[PDB]
Design a binder for this molecule. Sequence first.
Ligand SMILES: O=C(O)c1cc(-n2cccc2)ccn1
Lengths: 143, 134
Amino acid sequence: TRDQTSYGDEIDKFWLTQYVIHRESYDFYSVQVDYTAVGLMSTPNVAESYQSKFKGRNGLDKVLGDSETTRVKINSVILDKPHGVATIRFTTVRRVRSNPVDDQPQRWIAIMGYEYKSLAMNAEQRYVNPLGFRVTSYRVNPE
Amino acid sequence: YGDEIDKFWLTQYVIHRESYDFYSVQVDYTAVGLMSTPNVAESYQSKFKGRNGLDSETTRVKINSVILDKPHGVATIRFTTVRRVRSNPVDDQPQRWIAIMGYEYKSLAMNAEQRYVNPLGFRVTSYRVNPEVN
Ligand SMILES: O=C(O)c1cc(-n2cccc2)ccn1
């Protein structure tokens, strides 16, 4: 909509958490929806390193299928609105359909830079991102 | 504009209206004033209208469900509240409720005011809330 670094605590918090759930979760049924969302909510450079694991024969969706899944769980969010910086602590629970039960959960820390860029958008894009939220920097490290 | 985007303003609205706070009384009253129509918003202010407007107590909320009815702009939110007076050293016994509301997206007038709370023009048309006891 409008060039803007921040939209408030609650607004930024929703877009940030949604992003992590889209990009760190893997469900064979929603992969296309998750894939499309991360692209629109990211700069080309940020979207490039994520789309890489999906290209070619050994693309994640081509290899995994529905043999496994990873669930995502948000645990806390720290906003630095004036700088467009945000820290996110979350948990991920993987599974494989051939094992008895789930495997041990994994704690992560996400350091994200975000903004709201005003640019042209098509109909199918108005559904994904209204305020034009975009991640300009992303990297996760173990807890 | 999608389920998640709608569920956000809805749950936030239920949290805004069905709660009670003072740091946030200057932020919740103002918040609901923008996410509501002049028709369904006077039933919410009517609670302080006059001299006897509503620190001695508090009321917090936790969302437990969302179900959506897209084509109509309605939702079936189910939440719980907890009352607490400054005096009583412990919280009150929880109570469970049910609500359905009307929302729309009509960005007719928007200023410096709504960017923080409501820049997407989320507006509530209808409201009701009724309890639930098994
Ligand atoms: O990213 C989503 O919004 C999502 C994730 C999942 N999911 C469940 C386990 C792992 C990913 C299912 C449906 N939607």
